[PDB]
C-alpha cells in the first residue's frame, strides 16, 4: 500500500507520529510466505522496539531502517512470546547492544522453543499488569499479561499517548476465520485472555497484531467470539 516503505525484506508503515509497524515474512517451504508485524516507538531521544522479525538478518534490517530514517538509539526491545516470529532475531538485537525484555516464562521456555532468551525477565501481578521494577524506563510502553491464549506466555503492550495497543499473536483481525497456530495454545482460557487485553487498554482504538493489518477494537471481540467456541 502507498505510503509503506521497504528496506531489504522488511516493510514499514507509520501508524502515528511516533509509531511505526514493522513487517517481516517467512517462507514456509513452497508454502505461504507468512507476515509478522511488530512495532517501533520513538520516545523523545530514543527508540523502543516491540518484537523481532522472523530472523536475525531481518532483525538487523529493522535496526538499520531505524538508524537511517529515525537516527536515534534503540534503548530496549520487548518481545511478546517465545515463537520465531517474535524472538527469532534476539541474536541480532544483542549484537546491536539493545537491552532485551520478555515475560520470564518466555525466557524459561525459550530453549525448548529454539529461541534465544532475552536478557531481562518481566513479571506480572495477578491483575495482569507488569511489576514495574522489572520494566524500568519503559516510557510510554505499558505491558500487560492477559492470561494464556495463543501461548501461555503471550504478553501485550499499549502505547501511552496514542490510540494504539498491540495484541501480538493473541488477537486476530475481525474477519479472521480461525485462530491461526494453536500448537502452544491454551484453548480453555483463550477467550478470557482476549477480553482481558481489551479491558487493559480500554481507550485503544487501533489494535495492532502480529498476523493481520491494524484493525479496530472489533478484532478483540471477534477473536474472543472465536475462542469462545474452543471451550
Ligand X SMILES: FC(F)(F)c1nnc(S)n1/N=C/c1cccc(Br)c1
Which positions touch Zn ion (CB under 5 A)? 83, 85, 169, 210
Question: Which CB atom, from 9 or from 91, has the smaller least distance to Ca ion?
Answer: 91
Cα 197 vs. chain centroid, distance in angstroms?
Answer: 13
What are the grid coordinates assigned to 49, written together? 522496539
**To which residue does cell 507468512 refer?**
34
Report in angstroms how near the CB of residue 70 gets to ligand X at its nearest: 28
Task: Considering only the C-alpha atoms of the chain, give the largest distance between any 2 of them, rounded to a whole number of Å.
Answer: 48
The residue of the chain with the least Cβ separation from ligand X equals 180
Decide: is 91 part of the binding site for Ca ion (CB under 5 A): yes
Decide: is 160 part of the binding site for Ca ion (CB under 5 A): no
Report DSSP letters for 58-75, one per residue. Answer: HHHHHHHHHHHHT---EE
Residue-wise over 11-46: b if at least 16 C-beta within 10 A, else e? bbbebeebbbbbbbbbeeeeeeebbbbbbbbbbeee
Decide: is 9 part of the binding site for Ca ion (CB under 5 A): no
| Residues that bind ligand X in the complex, under the rule CB under 6 A | 34, 83-85, 150, 169, 172, 180-181, 211
34 binding partner (options ligand X, Zn ion, Ca ion, none; Cβ < 5 to 8 Å by kind): ligand X
Report in angstroms how near the CB of residue 168 gets to Zn ion at its nearest: 7
Binding site for Ca ion (CB under 5 A): 56, 91, 184
Q: Write out the binding residues for Ca(2+).
A: 56, 91, 113, 184, 188
Amino acid at each position: 500500500e502507498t505510503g509503506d516503505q521497504r528496506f531489504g525484506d522488511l516493510v514499514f508503515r507509520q501508524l502515528a507520529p511516533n509509531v511505526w509497524q514493522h513487517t517481516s515474512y517467512l517462507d514456509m517451504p513452497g508454502f505461504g510466505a507468512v507476515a509478522s508485524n511488530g512495532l517501533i516507538v520513538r520516545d523523545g531521544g530514543r527508540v523502543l522496539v516491540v518484537d523481532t522479525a522472523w530472523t536475525d538478518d531481518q532483525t538487523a534490517q529493522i535496526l538499520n531502517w531505524i538508524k537511517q530514517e529515525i537516527n536515534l538509539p534503540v534503548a530496549l526491545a520487548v518481545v511478546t512470546h517465545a515463537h520465531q516470529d517474535k524472538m527469532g532475531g534476539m541474536d541480532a538485537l544483542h549484537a546491536a547492544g539493545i537491552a532485551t525484555y520478555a515475560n520470564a516464562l518466555s525466557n524459561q521456555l525459550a530453549p525448548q522453543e529454539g529461541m534465544v532468551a532475552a536478557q531481562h525477565s518481566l513479571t506480572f501481578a495477578a491483575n495482569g499488569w507488569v511489576e514495574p521494577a522489572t520494566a524500568p524506563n519503559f516510557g510510554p510502553l505499558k505491558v500487560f499479561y492477559p492470561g494464556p491464549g495463543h501461548t501461555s506466555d503471550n504478553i501485550t503492550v499499549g502505547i501511552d499517548g496514542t490510540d494504539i495497543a498491540f495484541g501480538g499473536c493473541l488477537i486476530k483481525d475481525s474477519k479472521a476465520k480461525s485462530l491461526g497456530n494453536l500448537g502452544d495454545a491454551d484453548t480453555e482460557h483463550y477467550a478470557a485472555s482476549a477480553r482481558a487485553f481489551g479491558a487493559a487498554f480500554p481507550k485503544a482504538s487501533m489494535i495492532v497484531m502480529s498476523h493481520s493489518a491494524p484493525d479496530s477494537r472489533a478484532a478483540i471481540t471477534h477473536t474472543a467470539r472465536m475462542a469462545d467456541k474452543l471451550r
